[PDB]
Amino acid sequence: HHWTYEGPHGQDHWPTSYPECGGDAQSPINIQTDSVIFDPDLPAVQPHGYDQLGTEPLDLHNNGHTVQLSLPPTLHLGGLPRKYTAAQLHLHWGQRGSLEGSEHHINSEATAAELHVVHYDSQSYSSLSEAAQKPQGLAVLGILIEVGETENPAYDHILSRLHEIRYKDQKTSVPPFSVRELFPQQLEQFFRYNGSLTTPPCYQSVLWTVFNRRAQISMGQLEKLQETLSSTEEDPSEPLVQNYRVPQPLNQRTIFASF
Numbered sequence: 001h002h003w004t005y006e007g008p009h010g011q012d013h014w015p016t017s018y019p020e021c022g023g024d025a026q027s028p029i030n031i032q033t034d035s036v037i038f039d040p041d042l043p044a045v046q047p048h049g050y051d052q053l054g055t056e057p058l059d060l061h062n063n064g065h066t067v068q069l070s071l072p073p074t075l076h077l078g079g080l081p082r083k084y085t086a087a088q089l090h091l092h093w094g095q096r097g098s099l100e101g102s103e104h105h106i107n108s109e110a111t112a113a114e115l116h117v118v119h120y121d122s123q124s125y126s127s128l129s130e131a132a133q134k135p136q137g138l139a140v141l142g143i144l145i146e147v148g149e150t151e152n153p154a155y156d157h158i159l160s161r162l163h164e165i166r167y168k169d170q171k172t173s174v175p176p177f178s179v180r181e182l183f184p185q186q187l188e189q190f191f192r193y194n195g196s197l198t199t200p201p202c203y204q205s206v207l208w209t210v211f212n213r214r215a216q217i218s219m220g221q222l223e224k225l226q227e228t229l230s231s232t233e234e235d236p237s238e239p240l241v242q243n244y245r246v247p248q249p250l251n252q253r254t255i256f257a258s259f
């Protein structure tokens, strides 16, 4: 009953146990810039005070599928059709030695890792779980991550505590830092489109926003994230790597772009 990324119960078999996973509007997708429909009327994606996470420790845990940080309900995402509220944040990366770990592609090119900031329509629904299966219920932000030559301080707020949550299900708290700094510096350029969650149940309620600019972390930072967490509760451990879904069929969907 426990899905994994590759293997007997890998993403290839999700449709079997999770019908929605074989939906017509699944994510991620390979964004082809030539097919992108320019939309000068798309308002800017503006994260309201994502540099102010309050005072309380944030929860950072291990799913055996990814490292996930928790976010206060005070974080509000503007610029979309409805008002969305940040709920969680996590990562996707490739195995040790690979420089391809993102889920979304750009003209068939994948980056080293991808950051997903999951939001939910708190204006039309009570909770995130309520919106998880509502049309346009969720709103995710996809930040593609490349390997730069300088150390990224924004990400150490998470990479510097990965050893505390090595095994699946372990958790911990971290001093609240500026999440805004995890996003690329310029947010003007982005692609919008209707997608789904990239893990079972694969609900098609996500209104995606994949930024065009990328975020960079040292090759050292990428290795830490790649070789620290395990997917098991206890030993023998098993590298929690290759935790990304492969690009899915676009099935005649329009991918808009702010630029």
Ligand SMILES: *[C@@H]1O[C@H](CO)[C@@H](O[C@@H]2O[C@H](CO)[C@@H](O)[C@H](O)[C@H]2NC(C)=O)[C@H](O)[C@H]1NC(C)=O
Residues within 6 Å of the ligand: 192, 193, 194, 254, 256
């Ligand atoms: C995601 O899907 C929704 C619904 O199919 C799209 O919204 C529709 O947009 C048209 C014109 O753009 C309206 O006439 C419809 O009424 C909208 N549907 C409803 C019921 O809200 C939306 O454009 C898609 N998002 C993107 C940008 O791909």
Ligand SMILES: [Cl-]
Residues within 6 Å of the ligand: 001, 002
């Ligand atoms: Cl089982």
Ligand SMILES: [Zn+2]
Residues within 6 Å of the ligand: 090, 091, 092, 116, 198
């Ligand atoms: Zn994700």
